[PDB]
Amino acid sequence: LNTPEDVQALVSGKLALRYAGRQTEALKCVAQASKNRSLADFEKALTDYRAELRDDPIISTHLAKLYDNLLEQNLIRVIEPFSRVQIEHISSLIKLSKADVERKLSQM
Amino acid sequence: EKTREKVKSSDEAVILCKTAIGALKLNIGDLQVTKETIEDVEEMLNNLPGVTSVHSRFYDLSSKYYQTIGNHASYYKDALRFLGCVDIKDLPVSEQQERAFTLGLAGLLGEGVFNFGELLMHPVLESLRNTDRQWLIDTLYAFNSGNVERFQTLKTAWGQQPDLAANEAQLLRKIQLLCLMEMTFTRPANHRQLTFEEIAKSAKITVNEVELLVMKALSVGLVKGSIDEVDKRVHMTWVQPRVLDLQQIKGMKDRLEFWCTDVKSMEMLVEHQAHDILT
Amino acid sequence: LHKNDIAINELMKRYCPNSVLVIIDVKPKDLGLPTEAYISVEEVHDDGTPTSKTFEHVTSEIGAEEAEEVGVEHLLRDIKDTTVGTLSQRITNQV
Amino acid sequence: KEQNGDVKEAASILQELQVETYGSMEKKERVEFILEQMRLCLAVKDYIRTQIISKKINTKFFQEENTEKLKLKYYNLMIQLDQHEGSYLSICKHYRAIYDTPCIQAESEKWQQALKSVVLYVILAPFDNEQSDLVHRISGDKKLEEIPKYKDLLKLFTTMELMRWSTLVEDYGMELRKGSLESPATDVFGSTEEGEKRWKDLKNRVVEHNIRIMAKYYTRITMKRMAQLLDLSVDESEAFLSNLVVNKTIFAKVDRLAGIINFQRPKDPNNLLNDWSQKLNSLMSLVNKTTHLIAKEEMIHNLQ
């Protein structure tokens, strides 16, 4: 529903704190990751809890928050191309994280 | 005040009252009363401004308003009221030529129209121009036609020592718009792209000021140009023109009749091909 | 026009303060539209002369009104309506 | 007032900050008590709690028509409310509500700093229409244009033409030492924790001063020439122009290819206005050429 404020406020809910565990750490870390849209935070905290990430087989939600954010990320990184573009106009403009973060942009 | 309160005479008593205020305003001071009643003169001149005596006295009070400094640039219009007011010389030439002297000086001191050699086929100044110092007119022509000959545009500092350094950078701006009329007026048609050497050479300025120059011309609003400086070579649009010379009347006849009879002749050729299918 | 026309103009600008003249031609062959408009205002002059009261050429046209051509296009009878596709363009070209 | 405010705080008075609006509203003591918690929430320092209680402030739109100068003396507290955290368009009506008592008062220095504080937030306010005609309204003032630094302010806004940041450092950093009013120049520039953020907003002003006229102009200039006419270098150009291409409402054009850019932003979808402008303008001017050149030729042969 993309209201991470209420996700934070309802993991601050009393009965969720009654029924807490490690999956609530997954919910809180991915909640902060979507709260601030640090896609590196998203990837890192996502892959930290992969064994509990299996219980959501809809990871299309997760890689579509990656994707459906990356669309407007490539929109804000496609308008700055006429402000001052830097070296390798197609594959050094983005965040460029962890050894060629492409095969996604070119894939799209 | 007596001959204003008892006199409502039919041959324009109110404007002669206001010019009496103007002509004896010479002692009462000229800042408390100038705006109010001197502006009230042309407020009351709303019937028919064709007396030319009230208009010459109106120049006299508006020129005292020019003395008590407000709007140096209004002196060109105040010249359009004195130069406008007088037609035949009706006062001694032996004071008129010094009036033309200080008229050129004070029209130089007000820089709003920046083409002050606009009307110089005007008799009751040109008969003074050919009796005053002959180079002051030629340096008005160095602000009218061409922005070079440092002899002229520095002889205006040689002869006229005061009141030039107080306007020197703005006079450099005036010669830097004189290049803007030159480059599309005198040169062959436009060249479509005009180099930094050209503007800087007529401007006698560096490379890194013609940019400020062409933006300042846009702030003035005489040219709608595209600032072509990928090559430092500037592209041209419409400019507010300068005075068409006699030789420029002739060269205008040349390129204009070139256009006229070429378009007319090739038009008759197109119609000569289009002549066969009328029926 | 002639120089008496300003006296005509200003002598009839007393009823309404504007009186626009109309040049016409009873034998027109070379002109375009007969209707012409002047107005008598002043710019006074560059030399600011004593009242250079000038006729000022206002733009003009032939007007238009619905069903005033009932007589006209029935009378003239010679009109080739809608010659788009033939020779009107070259008449405009020549002229 | 036991401890004049310890951690014992509004936990006993937020219960009381909602009652009197329902029993019997008195139009002054409710105001004199609704001012009491903005200094409490400056100690809380939560500015969204300060706008909870400012939501309780601005639910009292019936504010004028009192007995006396008390609301006109409330206004200093009403502006102490949103001096710092007041948003950069809220400062428009807020820092013109600072002026309601200096219209009435008989001071000329508190009125002078009232004028310089009704004008020095124009720098703070982002590019808008209400600001742009607000400075059309407040211009033509009585003692505001008497400050040549306000002539600098307006000169930085009329056609704008370029600016040098260091000449601005001169003209508006000699005002932080020269004193006639001293408190608004402190609050905007002399301060650090917010005044230096307003220095950053002044850097926004100098770079948007660049970008506005360079979006108006510069078709086919290069890039190092661009940065040296920006008065800020090429890495400073990518910083200072990335943070205004995030404005994402100005379309510009740059390329590298060796370090050379170009322009003409819409890629010219026109063969239409060429015909429109060129031919309609020229042909109608030429049909005027008959109607008025032969008019003047007939005039000059009336007078011959």
UniProtKB/Swiss-Prot annotation, chain A:
Domain PCI: 1-108
Location(s) in or outside the cell: Nucleus; Cytoplasm, Cytosol
Glycyl lysine isopeptide (Lys-Gly) (interchain with G-Cter in SUMO2) crosslink, residue number(s): 14
Tissue: Highly expressed in embryonic stem cells (ESCs). Expression decreases as ESCs differentiate.
Disulfide bond residue pairs: none
Record note on modification: Phosphorylated by AMPK.
Induction section of the entry: By FOXO4; expression in embryonic stem cells (ESCs) is mediated by FOXO4.
Recorded family membership: Belongs to the proteasome subunit S9 family.
Role of this protein: Component of the 26S proteasome, a multiprotein complex involved in the ATP-dependent degradation of ubiquitinated proteins. This complex plays a key role in the maintenance of protein homeostasis by removing misfolded or damaged proteins, which could impair cellular functions, and by removing proteins whose functions are no longer required. Therefore, the proteasome participates in numerous cellular processes, including cell cycle progression, apoptosis, or DNA damage repair. In the complex, PSMD11 is required for proteasome assembly.
Subunit description: Component of the 19S proteasome regulatory particle complex. The 26S proteasome consists of a 20S core particle (CP) and two 19S regulatory subunits (RP). The regulatory particle is made of a lid composed of 9 subunits including PSMD11, a base containing 6 ATPases and few additional components.
Protein name, as recorded: 26S proteasome non-ATPase regulatory subunit 11
Species in which this protein is naturally found: Homo sapiens
Annotated gene: PSMD11
From Swiss-Prot, chain B:
GO biological process, one term: meiosis I
GO cellular component, as recorded: cytosol; extracellular region; ficolin-1-rich granule lumen; membrane; nucleoplasm; nucleus; proteasome accessory complex; proteasome complex
Modification N6-acetyllysine occurs at: 201
GO molecular function, one term: structural molecule activity
Domain PCI: 74-241
Signal sequence region: none
Disulfide bond residue pairs: none
UniProt KW keywords: Acetylation, Proteasome
Protein purpose: Component of the 26S proteasome, a multiprotein complex involved in the ATP-dependent degradation of ubiquitinated proteins. This complex plays a key role in the maintenance of protein homeostasis by removing misfolded or damaged proteins, which could impair cellular functions, and by removing proteins whose functions are no longer required. Therefore, the proteasome participates in numerous cellular processes, including cell cycle progression, apoptosis, or DNA damage repair.
Subunit structure: Component of the 19S proteasome regulatory particle complex. The 26S proteasome consists of a 20S core particle (CP) and two 19S regulatory subunits (RP). The regulatory particle is made of a lid composed of 9 subunits including PSMD13, a base containing 6 ATPases and few additional components.
Protein family: Belongs to the proteasome subunit S11 family.
Protein name as catalogued: 26S proteasome non-ATPase regulatory subunit 13
Organism: Homo sapiens
Gene that encodes the chain: PSMD13
Curated annotation (Swiss-Prot), chain C:
Species of the source: Homo sapiens
Subunit structure and binding partners: Component of the 19S proteasome regulatory particle complex. The 26S proteasome consists of a 20S core particle (CP) and two 19S regulatory subunits (RP). The regulatory particle is made of a lid composed of 9 subunits including PSMD7, a base containing 6 ATPases and few additional components. Within the complex, PSMD7 interacts with subunit PSMD4 through their respective MPN domain. Interacts with TRIM5.
Other known facts: Does not bind a metal ion.
Origin: domain of life: Eukaryota
Name this protein carries in UniProt: 26S proteasome non-ATPase regulatory subunit 7
Similarity remark: Belongs to the peptidase M67A family.
Annotated function: Component of the 26S proteasome, a multiprotein complex involved in the ATP-dependent degradation of ubiquitinated proteins. This complex plays a key role in the maintenance of protein homeostasis by removing misfolded or damaged proteins, which could impair cellular functions, and by removing proteins whose functions are no longer required. Therefore, the proteasome participates in numerous cellular processes, including cell cycle progression, apoptosis, or DNA damage repair.
Glycyl lysine isopeptide (Lys-Gly) (interchain with G-Cter in ubiquitin) crosslink residues: 80
Swiss-Prot record, chain D:
Any one GO cellular component localisation term in the record: ficolin-1-rich granule lumen
Coiled-coil region list: none
UniProt entry tagged with the keyword Transport: no
Domain PCI: 90-268
Record flagged with keyword Membrane: no
BP-aspect Gene Ontology terms: proteasome-mediated ubiquitin-dependent protein catabolic process
Entry keyword set: Acetylation, Intellectual disability, Isopeptide bond, Proteasome, Ubl conjugation
Modified residues (N6-acetyllysine): 69, 216
Entry function: Component of the 26S proteasome, a multiprotein complex involved in the ATP-dependent degradation of ubiquitinated proteins. This complex plays a key role in the maintenance of protein homeostasis by removing misfolded or damaged proteins, which could impair cellular functions, and by removing proteins whose functions are no longer required. Therefore, the proteasome participates in numerous cellular processes, including cell cycle progression, apoptosis, or DNA damage repair.
Subunit structure as annotated in this protein's UniProt entry: Component of the 19S proteasome regulatory particle complex. The 26S proteasome consists of a 20S core particle (CP) and two 19S regulatory subunits (RP). The regulatory particle is made of a lid composed of 9 subunits including PSMD12, a base containing 6 ATPases and few additional components. Interacts with ERCC6.
Family: Belongs to the proteasome subunit p55 family.
Record protein name field: 26S proteasome non-ATPase regulatory subunit 12
Classification of source organism: Eukaryota, Metazoa, Chordata, Craniata, Vertebrata
Gene giving rise to this polypeptide: PSMD12
